[PDB]
């Protein structure tokens with residue numbers, strides 16, 4: 001009934017979306033029909049009005065902040081609690097892989113000696129933890145893997161996992177669900193058409209996880225499995241400690257329903273959100289929203305006042321995710337981005353604007369921190385846990401495939417030295433820990449199945465010397 | 481003669497160098513003779529003997545953190561900044577400050593690193609930006625004490641760069657400086673030497689040579705009489721700095737006033753090291769004497785050691801920015817330099833075999849010896865350390881086989897723009913959309929901003945060009961004023 005739809009669009013001020021209906025082959029016009037019939041126009045106008053209608057900080061109290069380095073007298077207790085939580089099948093992990101090289105970032109092969117993709121590395125960190133848990137508690141156990149993907153990448157991501165046999169995990173325990181979308185809209189409040197037959201659409205931000213969880217009953221799935229803790233994380237960090245027993249133990253022990261892992265920000269303009277509290281309410285002030293004066297404040301000790309860098313690693317309990325889906329979600333606000341958005345004009349010409357065209361609305365995953373009953377912050381070291389792959393080209397600065405590769409290999413290289421091993425050149429001369437910039441860097445990779453975080457390596461490496469590239473995996477020690 | 485040389489080579493066991501002598505054209509024979517002639521074979525044998533001991537069969541155990549009593553900070557002590565800076569500008573006005581650039585190293589994208597063009601909207605090379613900061617300080621000190629003044633630029637070159645460099649300055653009219661004040665001198669060299677202690681020929685007529693390390697600065701000063709040229713100019717302070725740092729604050733008045741005000745003969749500028757494996761030397765004290773333990777000579781356990789406050793115990797990263805008083809140099813050049821030791825590196829050295837065949841080994845076959853410039857800190861009457869922030873003063877441009885995602889031309893470009901972008905927001909300025917929507921300080925596009933040292937040395941004096949004005953990047957602010965490249 002397209003008479004019914006022309007009418008509801010025109011009342012919403014969007015009849016221009018059918019401007020070319022008569023120029024579309026029957027196939028075309030049914031793709032557009034079903035795409036429009038699936039939009040909540042009343043709601044999009046409300047969202048637009050609040051977005052358009054749009055237009056002091058304090059560090060968290062030391063009482064809520066734990067440190068992997070300063071509270072090392074506690075790492076053991078925390079690690080035991082997380083492995084214990086894992087062995088009880090009480091822990092699940094949720095990967096934010098929406099909004100993706102026009103391919104899923106988890107497929108990125110960084111040039112590691114073993115050529116593993118980010119998806120595989122993550123899967124093996126999950127397999128490892130299941131195995132360490134069993135070794136320490138005796139029972140077989142499961143850490144389910146919830147993967148939120150975008151429409152464009154759902155099928156391709158699934159095929160990729162089938163091709164790789166789920167990296168050794170069971171399909172039964174990997175749950176794929178997709179993120180929602182939102183249309184781009186010009187400054188006049190009209191939805192933008194990408195083509196004569198397609199609305200310019202984009203993922204609703206990683207904060208669209210909440211509406212996505214709801215739409216596919218993911219929480220009920222977690223409840224059915226009896227999961228208590230969810231480790232939410234970003235796909236681009238090759239160093240990500242998936243289901244990290246320490247971070248989780250910490251949160252369980254401090255009785256939190258919500259936690260965020262953090263690293264110290266030292267460069268005032270590093271594009272990292274900053275965890276803090278405003279009017280007693282916890283949140284992240286996204287880097288694109290801090291003033292330079294604040295980003296630059298320093299405390300007595302010489303460091304930045306706002307130095308708790310969000311590395312997009314959160315802990316959420318299931319009942320809390322339950323409250324968010326059932327109550328808080330509608331209260332989250334859209335963060336706005338003015339963008340140059342390709343569009344078909346009224347004259348049927350395809351335009352690539354040079355002046356920002358309209359806005360993109362996104363919800364942020366960390367905006368539910370303000371609703372948590374008990375929020376904690378966990379600080380870790382950068383070199384051990386955070387090396388984001390943000391831009392594939394090495395000409396956008398850092399955070400590219402080659403910095404991620406060296407970040408992982410440098411870490412593994414240090415695990416070997418700390419476990420008593422050494423690297424040598426062709427004559428058997430020992431290389432130093434940081435060899436001169438050719439007056440290699442050392443190629444080293446250790447499978448997560450062998451070492452989750454540097455432990456269990458003495459029997460393979462103590463007092464031994466290796467010629468890089470060195471890989472230590474399930475099949476032993478190999479110098480390529 | 482040749483039996484002169486020939487005999488010297490035999491006492492030395494370096495006879496094989498004339499192996500191809502009777503097979504060289506007159507031109508070739510003169511090139512080699514000259515090369516061999518400028519070499520101290522008996523000494524080289526002694527250096528090799530000392531360098532090779534480094535393999536036999538421990539500084540780390542004796543290393544101690546820099547004590548608080550010698551450490552000054554641009555952050556923790558900003559209240560003393562105005563004083564240090566005017567003190568520094570005073571020395572510059574008094575004509576008592578010279579700058580010395582270490583540029584005998586190479587670069588390969590094969591040419592002087594100083595000649596690199598990083599993609600800045602102005603396109604200036606590192607050499608130019610430095611000369612402009614030197615020009616700047618001269619205008620500022622004049623327009624602050626009333627007299628014209630000079631910051632002489634001594635530039636240590638190597639057999640590699642010398643020619644290329646000189647021609648480049650001449651081509652650019654010394655960027656506005658006066659050539660009588662840009663003193664080029666040449667660094668010495670050392671031959672590659674195999675493990676058996678034999679000097680390596682790279683051609684039948686060419687000894688395989690390389691610059692003797694930035695520490696080769698000291699014999700270099702004595703050879704070309706540089707210390708005397710400095711004394712004849714009435715220079716008291718010398719700012720020694722690395723060529724590859726695009727943010728380098730040449731003849732930095734604050735750093736200079738700090739050391740002079742604290743009465744030092746020697747000072748090092750450092751930045752906080754946070755990553756254990758960052759390749760920067762670390763300033764430290766060993767047996768009551770200051771040293772820099774180079775990144776390649778520290779153990780991982782030391783590099784990773786933390787202090788109670790959570791930062792690296794050895795966090796004073798060396799940025800190759802030093803302060804030496806001319807008298808201290810005096811003593812170094814003619815009293816202490818013989819105690820400097822060579823740091824060694826095993827290398828794969830292309831060589832010519834006994835039958836004339838050029839070979840490229842797949843295994844290291846010899847060593848390279850180098851002296852390091854900071855190894856004189858230990859001889860100082862009073863050593864001082866001055867901590868400064870990375871983003872304002874340190875963004876190294878290293879060789880391609882030493883970047884690995886960073887410390888490259890593009891990160892160097894991003895560091896100068898980010899700094900200038902920030903200097904602008906701090907002076908009340910703002911950047912905007914094509915629609916004029918004001919951009920955040922850190923948009924989610926790398927805001928291209930470039931301010932000339934002539935307009936601003938460290939972010940000062942921009943209020944007029946910038947307070948309360950919005951700008952369209954890319955933005956360039958130079959002598960000819962404010963420019964928007966659209």
Ligand SMILES: CC(=O)N[C@H]1[C@@H](OP(=O)(O)OP(=O)(O)OC[C@H]2O[C@@H](n3ccc(=O)[nH]c3=O)[C@H](O)[C@@H]2O)O[C@H](CO)[C@@H](O)[C@@H]1O
Pocket residue numbers: 096097098099100148179203204205206207208233234235236271272273274284286287309310311312364365366388390924
């Ligand atoms: C909103 C948010 O989290 N911002 C954080 C994110 O910012 P940043 O802006 O860098 O990254 P993005 O929010 O765009 O993306 C981060 C993660 O979110 C996912 N994603 C993104 C958009 C989307 O619609 N759907 C989706 O699932 C990506 O797959 C990725 O896993 O990482 C930084 C660390 O590197 C943190 O310091 C920032 O505070």
Ligand SMILES: CC(=O)N[C@H]1[C@@H](OP(=O)(O)OP(=O)(O)OC[C@H]2O[C@@H](n3ccc(=O)[nH]c3=O)[C@H](O)[C@@H]2O)O[C@H](CO)[C@@H](O)[C@@H]1O
Pocket residue numbers: 436437439582583584585586636638667691692693694696721722723724759760761762772774775797798799800852853854876
């Ligand atoms: C010996 C030395 O200074 N090491 C420092 C240098 O090491 P790094 O390894 O970076 O560099 P190099 O020791 O090769 O020397 C860098 C500087 O020295 C010059 N040069 C080098 C060799 C030579 O024979 N002649 C010469 O003039 C180069 O032109 C450049 O100006 O910079 C780092 C900062 O990035 C510091 O943390 C290191 O402690």
